[PDB]
Design a protein around this ligand. Structure first.
Ligand SMILES: *Cc1c(COP(=O)(O)O)cnc(C)c1O
Ligand SMILES: *Cc1c(COP(=O)(O)O)cnc(C)c1O
Ligand code: NA
Ligand code: NA
Lengths: 390, 255, 390, 255
């Protein structure tokens, strides 16, 4: 029994052990209360404005589009405190923990950016934060592990399984049934069991709300498409939500194609995986033929979640959103191109969304089109991955 | 088949509780697993719970995590586990055999085909660890069409609505996760399948205690799996110490 | 002959070779034109809003001040595109280059942040950018050198002298007399020969203008003091300017005290150096007894300019502003303290201003005071300097 | 003293231009510097321009940058340069001696004391490289009170107001930085100090050319300093090749 629908068509649900259901039902009920509570909305808006720096700019990029009929804007989540969109929803979740009287935060993270987000929000809001991170990702994300520790969080390496993000996701789900009374699990994307796909969407939907107001001010009409990369689905659904009912607006999600979809070394389960059940949800998964879950491969470490949020698999199935893939070398080209022609260093995750906008422009240069890319994060973290390869 | 109903009648005729060990199939390899299992039965197990190795066993602690690691280091797959199960059933026709599965392995290539495969090899029950009663309808219905008992866990704090649903939906036994006196009587009140206490059971006095509280028996897994873990480079020591533990635990269950 | 006064009391002036005077007089005249030209003001404001992300937040820090009568706000220049306040004035200078018809930009830089700023602005505005950097700073600022190159600028190592920032300043001043016809010299702080102290102040004065509007909205009165670190003087004079005529507002500048002013290993020439003439100006300098210029020492590499802007030496001499110093270990403590209690990683330069606010609070905990620290930059760049030391 | 006025009268009596070499004092060390200087004079220099090593010589190219590097590697300081100058004056009473200074070394411990020190040791002129005419008033006034000629550079594009100011403010010679025909005649028109062409002069034909255009002579520095640079590990070769160059350059200046 729930207050809100846990599925999006066939996808979603609550596939957790029985002992975790009360934690999900309690979080659902707190969230429906807070969404109606004007005091919680004004505390969240004040943190997003005066702490995190909302609203973020919408930047036109006239040097990239010259000599074509594409007009491209970038929604600047890279300017948000923390350098990526993940801050928005951690702040909301942290305030939901406090409204439930919890004192402690559990989070998982892969490339480290959700861990840092969760540790900043827990330091600001006086929550005790512990993070699980696969030990192969602790070893390769020295700078984020240190940030987390500077901010007072406990980083717990996970050595089981593949010692990467899905193994840290399992460890969070093993700790919460013994701690949900005083600890909230601040999940890092719009996936997992209900209510998380719906809570993370609602706490990221200001991306698209601001983008609609900003593009109507600057061009007097909505975009022809909004384009966002898709690791687990949070930044894209936060850009897409306020546009779902504007039927002329395209919604394009970009999954990582890694070394190319034919090589099998990619992270594109929505269009190239198979539906399974894991991490609390029915959704498309990277998995073997016999149903073992596998890792996603991308040059961008932040597109490593090995499934996808259930609302994107549903918006794909009905034809409302379209999902594509971009390979490591297209993402790298788009990162170099934004650095040199607009003086903006984009995260390599967001570089996959920019790469697809560049192909829409270059493939049809005389097509008139108004495009917004969600620039989910800044890419200072990537500059020597980009160095070492070139 | 009604192997659990047959068992619990037999054990009620003797005022005896069941003692049910858990192991991961294939740990530490198929041949040694099949000897471990035969040792458990000869030493007195009344029924078996058996795990199919899964990449992400999000409801299990470190001892079973590491059992699954060992089985995958041996190349164990779900199809090799179903070959093992058919062999174990052909040696042992009456002991009840339950699987502990993760959902994706049952949903993989189709839930009704997974329960049909169970029925063909002679499995009696399946507990899917990450399917709560609220998500259970296609699993329980497919289990019942293929004469497989769907097992549910009753959590320690289960409210009344949850007790009534586990009662109604489960068969075979109720997995009562580990003063259970109230949840045990409520289960009987609602005509639930008989309760087996599980989690943490590692010594004879707990076996005795679960039967005195009114449960039909007790399940133990990590304690059995730690004996495997401890004895890997002496397979014959492994069998002997498994025999000593199970014989002790089942003796605690006798009246 | 000039349009505007090149001195602030005794300090300032135009001490360059004769062959450079026409470049300064041309830049002065372009700047007085652009300051009256409403089109140039609207092109600069649109870049600062939609490209750089102005206005930046003013964040109250209630966890740091608990149990005292200090209320502290941080002006969030760390959220500006590029991560530090230097972006504001590079954008202005770049538009002044284009208004003079120049196609090329010359800049110097030390820790690399001005080089990156100048390279981002030159990429956005289609200027060809070359930067001079001491070769000992190229070697130790690998990440910034790479950013610059990603953004299309030419980085030229300077091996003469001490191969640090002052040696790159000399090399810019040697290239400009042969190139001022088509190249503008985008100086990196509020120092150097007139008109640079005045142009950089005016192009950073939005810091303080926004801070005054924001603190009147949030507290209904002006601050008791605004506090900023002082390397060359740009972020501080950009915070101080709009408050100079509000006589009740304290203006506190913080120079680096390094290992301590008695050791001689510091970067505090305003209060502990001697007036000299170098880099185009009469101002307090780090220099030997016989007049050789020396380097500034600080744990923060960005407080390395070995003099100070002339308007701060003048505001000190008349008593309008007060200048203090903070040592490397006080700055490090203030960096750790903001990370753990507010989830903000500050640059180590700005950590010197926060350290002094913390001492004003801790030294007198029952004094009622409203303080604003200008948080000039973010400190992701410092996290392993901070690691390796701890 | 009026050493420059005496010189240019003497050289006008012979329809001859001046040839004035530049070196950094102390490069590559005090003793070798003092022999280099004596060699320049014996080979025919009419006047000397001499640099005091400064940490940040922002108006100089690489050859002189490196001369100052070498002098600092030898421990040369401004006080040691003034000892050198007193020695050079006591050996050579009539040759004019000009300093090329950076401002901070003149302002250091007081502008009037710096020009008084010049006058005590027998220096005739001082060019401060980074003091434009607009900032020159305390320097030129202090120079004139201590009978030192303040030298100014006239840039190649100097407008009329700048020509008139260099004319009025300079003494000794005008440094005409390197078709100067118009700037030379304008300087004469305004009664400027006689012009010496400087920057780039490295061969005899330019010496001839500067005198034909109407200048009173020419200064050369990098070319002299490169001979030092080239010959460091053979001090005696260094002296001989300096002698050969200066004798050539001064012969180009004769009528
Ligand atoms: C983590 C991250 C992503 C991917 O996560 P989503 O939930 O799909 O948004 C994308 N961009 C940045 C910059 C990230 O840090
Ligand atoms: C360069 C820099 C400084 C010092 O320069 P000022 O001109 O004194 O402002 C201060 N903070 C940051 C973050 C810097 O990058
Ligand atoms: Na994914
Ligand atoms: Na300084």
């Amino acid at each position: 029994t729930t207050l809100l629908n846990p599925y999006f068509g066939e996808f979603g649900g609550m596939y957790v052990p029985q002992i975790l259901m009360p934690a999900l039902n309690q979080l659902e009920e707190a969230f429906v209360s807070a969404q109606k509570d004007p005091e919680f909305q004004a505390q969240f808006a004040d943190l997003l404005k005066n702490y995190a720096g909302r609203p973020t700019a919408l930047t036109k990029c006239q040097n990239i589009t010259a000599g074509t009929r594409t007009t491209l804007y970038l929604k600047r989540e890279d300017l948000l405190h923390g350098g990526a969109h993940k801050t928005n929803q951690v702040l909301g979740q942290a305030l939901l923990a406090k409204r439930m009287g919890k004192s402690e935060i559990i989070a998982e993270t892969g490339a480290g950016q959700h861990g840092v987000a969760s540790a900043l929000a827990s330091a600001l809001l006086g929550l005790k934060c512990r993070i699980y991170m696969g030990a192969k990702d602790v070893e390769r994300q020295s700078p984020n592990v240190f940030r987390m520790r500077l901010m007072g969080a406990e980083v717990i390496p996970v050595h089981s399984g593949s010692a990467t993000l899905k193994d840290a996701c399992n460890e969070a789900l093993r700790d919460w049934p013994g701690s949900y009374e005083t600890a909230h699990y601040m999940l890092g994307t719009a996936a997992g069991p209900h209510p998380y796909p719906t809570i993370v969407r609602e706490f990221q939907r200001m991306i698209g709300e601001e983008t609609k107001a900003q593009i109507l001010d600057k061009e007097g009409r909505l975009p022809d498409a909004v384009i966002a990369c898709v690791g687990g689905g949070s930044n894209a659904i936060g850009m897409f939500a306020d546009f779902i009912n504007d039927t002329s607006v395209g919604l394009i999600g970009v999954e990582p194609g890694g070394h190319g979809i034919e090589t099998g070394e990619h992270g594109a389960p929505l269009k190239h995986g198979r539906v399974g059940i894991y991490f609390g949800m029915k959704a498309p998964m990277m998995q073997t033929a016999d149903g073992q879950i596998e890792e996603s491969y991308s040059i961008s470490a932040g597109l490593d979640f090995p499934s996808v949020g259930p609302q994107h698999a549903y918006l794909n199935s009905i034809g409302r959103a379209d999902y594509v893939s971009i390979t490591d070398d297209e993402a790298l080209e788009a990162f170099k191109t934004l650095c040199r022609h607009e003086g903006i260093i984009p995260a390599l995750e967001s570089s996959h969304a920019l790469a697809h906008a560049l192909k829409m422009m270059r493939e049809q240069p005389e097509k008139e089109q108004l495009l917004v890319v969600n620039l989910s994060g800044r890419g200072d973290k990537d500059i020597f991955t980009v160095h070492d390869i070139l | 088949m009604e192997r659990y109903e047959n068992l619990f009648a037999q054990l009620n005729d003797r005022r005896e509780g069941a003692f049910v060990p858990f192991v991961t199939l294939g740990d530490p390899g198929i041949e040694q697993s099949l000897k471990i299992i035969d040792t458990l039965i000869d030493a007195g197990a009344d029924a078996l719970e058996l795990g199919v190795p899964f990449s992400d066993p999000l409801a299990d602690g470190p001892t079973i995590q590491n059992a699954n690691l060992r089985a995958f280091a041996a190349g164990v797959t779900p199809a090799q586990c179903f070959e093992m199960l058919a062999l174990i059933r052909e040696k042992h026709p009456t002991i009840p055999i339950g699987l502990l599965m993760y959902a994706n392995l049952v949903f993989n290539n189709g839930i009704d085909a997974f329960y049909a495969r169970c029925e063909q090899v002679g499995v009696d029950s399946v507990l899917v660890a990450d399917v709560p009663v609220e998500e259970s309808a296609p699993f329980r219905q497919a289990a019942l069409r293929h004469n497989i008992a769907p097992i549910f866990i009753c959590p320690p704090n289960a409210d009344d609505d949850l007790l009534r649903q586990v009662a109604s939906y489960g068969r075979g036994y109720t997995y009562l996760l580990s003063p259970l006196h109230h949840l045990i009587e409520k289960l009987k009140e609602y005509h639930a399948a008989p309760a087996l206490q599980g989690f943490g059971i590692s010594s004879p006095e707990q076996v005795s205690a679960a039967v005195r509280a009114g449960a039909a028996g007790a399940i133990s897994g990590s304690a059995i799996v730690k004996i495997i873990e401890k004895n890997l480079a002496s397979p014959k020591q492994m069998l002997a110490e498994l025999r000593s533990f199970v014989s002790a635990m089942k003796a605690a269950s006798r009246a």
